[PDB]
Design a protein around this ligand. Structure first.
Ligand SMILES: CCc1cccc(Nc2cc(N[C@@H]3CCCC[C@@H]3N)nnc2C(N)=O)n1
Length: 265
């Protein structure tokens, strides 16, 4: 898991901003692999906890960690998803078609169904934390808030991304894969809204209040009703009645095949 600083070449250009994300290349036994490197008391331990989660995960829809390096600062070295975060990608590429958006959100749901099966909670599932390897290949990243669930519990009991959080996170501090489903609803809303931020012009406290009145964000212009219906299902107030990701992924999987069919027609 511990990498050799010698074998890492980082570019001077920042990709963006814990600290910074830089692009780099890492010398493997034969190939060079292009990498995205997160570069940094509580912040070190957090980086290391994040690396500890990622070490445990192995799925085509989840960013792979190469390892960690302690050099100028602590660094978390991951495979590079070249096209970057989904929200910035859709803001910058408004021509992306709805069939392609469904593909990508379905890939996210396959990755989440895997995280659920593995009993990890992401706790920061948002379009900014979905990274594009290509325009047809999304992978989930950014595990800095993620928790491995205890063997005996199905929720983790705790500066939060409130607009992505389910009511029970806000009201009871409880985080389960069902609360990640709520977030995956907001992520879908983002995806079908050209990557715009949710609950425009509202503070978190007004969001919680909106949601407690049973109000939900409206359908994004041009969004398939079946996708908006699925967003609404993810935003089921009562955690016990909210679907898990197996149910979610099956719904998206079937809709995706329907759309692919209409396209061949
Ligand atoms: C910098 C924006 C940016 C542009 C291009 C690639 C990447 N790569 C990543 C960013 C990241 N986290 C950032 C952290 C800051 C906000 C955006 C994003 N969630 N996590 N993993 C990768 C990766 N493995 O390729 N990031």
């Amino acid at each position: 898991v511990y990498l050799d600083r010698k074998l890492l070449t980082l570019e001077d250009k920042e990709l963006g901003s814990f600290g910074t994300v830089k692009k780099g290349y890492y010398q493997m036994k034969k190939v060079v692999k292009t990498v995205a490197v997160k570069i940094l008391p509580a912040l070190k331990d957090e980086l290391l906890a994040e690396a500890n989660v990622m070490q445990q995960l192995d799925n085509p829809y989840i960013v792979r960690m190469i390892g960690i390096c302690e050099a100028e600062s602590w660094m978390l070295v991951m495979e590079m998803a070249e096209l970057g975060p989904l929200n910035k990608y859709l803001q910058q590429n408004r021509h992306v078609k709805d069939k392609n958006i469904i593909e990508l959100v379905h890939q996210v749901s396959m990755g989440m169904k895997y995280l659920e099966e593995s009993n990890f909670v992401h706790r920061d599932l948002a379009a900014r934390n979905v990274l594009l390897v290509t325009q047809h290949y999304a992978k989930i990243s950014d595990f800095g808030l993620s928790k491995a669930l205890r063997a005996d519990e199905n929720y983790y009991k705790a500066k939060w991304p409130v607009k992505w959080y389910a009511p029970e996170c806000i009201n009871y501090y409880k985080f389960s894969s069902k609360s990640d489903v709520w977030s995956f609803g907001v992520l879908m809303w983002e995806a079908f809204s050209y990557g715009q931020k949710p609950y425009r012009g509202m503070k978190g406290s007004e969001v919680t209040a909106m949601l407690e009145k049973g109000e939900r964000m409206g359908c994004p212009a041009g969004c398939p009703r079946e996708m908006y219906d699925l967003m609404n299902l993810c935003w089921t107030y009562d955690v016990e009645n909210r679907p898990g990701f197996a149910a979610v992924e099956l719904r998206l999987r079937n809709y995706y095949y329907d759309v692919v069919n209409e396209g061949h027609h």
